[PDB]
From a paper:
The small leucine-rich proteoglycans (SLRPs) constitute a family of secreted proteins with important roles in extracellular matrix assembly and cell signalling. The SLRPs belong to the large superfamily of leucine-rich repeat (LRR) proteins, which includes not only secreted proteins but also a large number of cell surface receptors, such as the Toll-like receptors involved in innate immunity, the platelet von Willebrand factor receptor, glycoprotein Ib, and proteins involved in neural development. Here, we report the crystal structure of fibromodulin and a different crystal form of [name], which reveal that these SLRPs do not self-associate in the same manner as decorin or biglycan. The results demonstrate that, unlike decorin, neither fibromodulin nor [name] forms a stable dimer in solution.
One of the more distant homologues of fibromodulin is [name], a class IV SLRP found in cartilage and bone. In contrast to fibromodulin, [name] does not contain an N-terminal tyrosine sulphate-rich region or any N-linked glycans. We obtained crystals of human [name] and determined the structure at 2.17 Å resolution. The structure is complete except for the C-terminal 13 residues. The asymmetric unit of the crystals contains two structurally similar copies of [name] (r.m.s. deviation of 0.7 Å for 327 Cα atoms). Firstly, the LRRNT domain of [name] more closely corresponds to the consensus structure with two anti parallel β-strands, and its second strand is part of a standard LRR motif. Secondly, the LRRs II-XI of [name] are more uniform in length (24–25 residues), resulting in a slightly higher curvature of the concave face. Thirdly, the ear and LRR XII of fibromodulin are replaced by a C-terminal cap (LRRCT) in [name]. The LRRCT is characterised by a 10-residue α-helix and two disulphide bonds (Cys304-Cys326 and Cys306-Cys346 in [name]).
Residue numbers in the entry: 20 to 347
The structure:
């Protein structure tokens, strides 16, 4: 009785149902053996409760570009086997708790390029298996305590190009296994110490394009034994505090380009450092920069930049200049 829907293209004996831009106004009825349902580029302004009934074997659901504005509570009830959910490129503003009920198995959730403004408590509570939460290009302004409550195994959190200006203490307490954290291109006017101080296994921290101005003491200590990649490019960075890199023991990749740095802290970790972007900084070629000098001459392929001061060595390259001869 159940066959491929009208104007749709089915594959793998009705296991894959593709309805790409076919003028749908309602969720079509599909066979119970459906495992992949692509409803991209249709029109579903409101996803009501039980919008996907009788799809117990569905593992991948694609709903991008569907002009979706609201996801009602229990919109995805029954999808106990769903692994992928794409809600990217819609007009979602309202996203309340219950919207993600029954999504016990969901591992990848894409909500990027929407109009979400907040992440209320309990919204992600059912998502105990979520690994990637892609929320880039929204309008979230603030993360508060319990914003990620229930997200037990969240590893990658994408929040690039939002309007974040505040991370409350306790905001990330629920995401202990967090490895990737992208909050570049936001409104962070200071390093969110309190929020990050609770995480221990962060490996990549992307903070580019935030007016951070400076990095405080113990900025990375909590997760200092796991931090491998750090982006601080275009953060209007004037300097690092003396204790900023306390407990950092395996940092491999750093991006500092496009800032106002003249110096580096004495405890700057060069021991595990592999790549370091440092162009477009008014570097001061004095004694305190010898550590960077010693690192650059340890492997020739490592790019460098030019000193803005002192006057004698203005414009010379860090690796070529004679500004470090009078210190040993
Ligand atoms: Cl086919
Ligand atoms: Ni096919």
């Amino acid at each position: 009785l159940a066959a491929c829907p009208q104007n749709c293209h089915c594959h793998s004996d009705l296991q894959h149902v593709i309805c790409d831009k076919v003028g749908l106004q309602k969720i079509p009825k599909v066979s119970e053996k459906t495992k992949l349902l692509n409803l991209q580029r249709n029109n579903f302004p409101v996803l009501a409760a039980n919008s996907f009934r009788a799809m117990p074997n569905l593992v991948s659901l694609h709903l991008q570009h569907c002009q979706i504005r609201e996801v009602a509570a229990g919109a995805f009830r029954g999808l106990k086997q769903l692994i992928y959910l794409y809600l990217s490129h819609n007009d979602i503003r309202v996203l309340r708790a219950g919207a993600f009920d029954d999504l016990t198995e969901l591992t990848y959730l894409y909500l990027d390029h929407n109009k979400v403004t907040e992440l209320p408590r309990g919204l992600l509570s059912p998502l105990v298996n979520l690994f990637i939460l892609q929320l880039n290009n929204n309008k979230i302004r603030e993360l508060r305590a319990g914003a990620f409550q229930g997200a037990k195994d969240l590893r990658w959190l994408y929040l690039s190009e939002n309007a974040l200006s505040s991370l409350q203490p306790g905001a990330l307490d629920d995401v202990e296994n967090l490895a990737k954290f992208h909050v570049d291109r936001n409104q962070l006017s200071s390093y969110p110490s309190a929020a990050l101080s609770k995480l221990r296994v962060v490996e990549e921290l992307k903070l580019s394009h935030n007016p951070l101005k400076s990095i405080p003491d113990n900025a990375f200590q909590s997760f200092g034994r796991y931090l491998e990649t750090l982006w601080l490019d275009n953060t209007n960075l004037e300097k690092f505090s003396d204790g900023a890199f306390l407990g950092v023991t395996t940092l491999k990749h750093v991006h500092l380009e496009n800032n106002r740095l003249n110096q580096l802290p004495s405890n700057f970790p060069f021991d595990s450092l592999e790549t370091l972007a440092l162009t477009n900084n008014p570097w001061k070629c004095t004694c305190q920069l010898r550590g960077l000098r010693r690192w650059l001459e340890a492997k020739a392929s490592r790019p460098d930049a030019t000193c803005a001061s002192p006057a004698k060595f203005k414009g010379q390259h860090i690796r070529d200049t004679d500004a470090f001869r009078s210190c040993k």
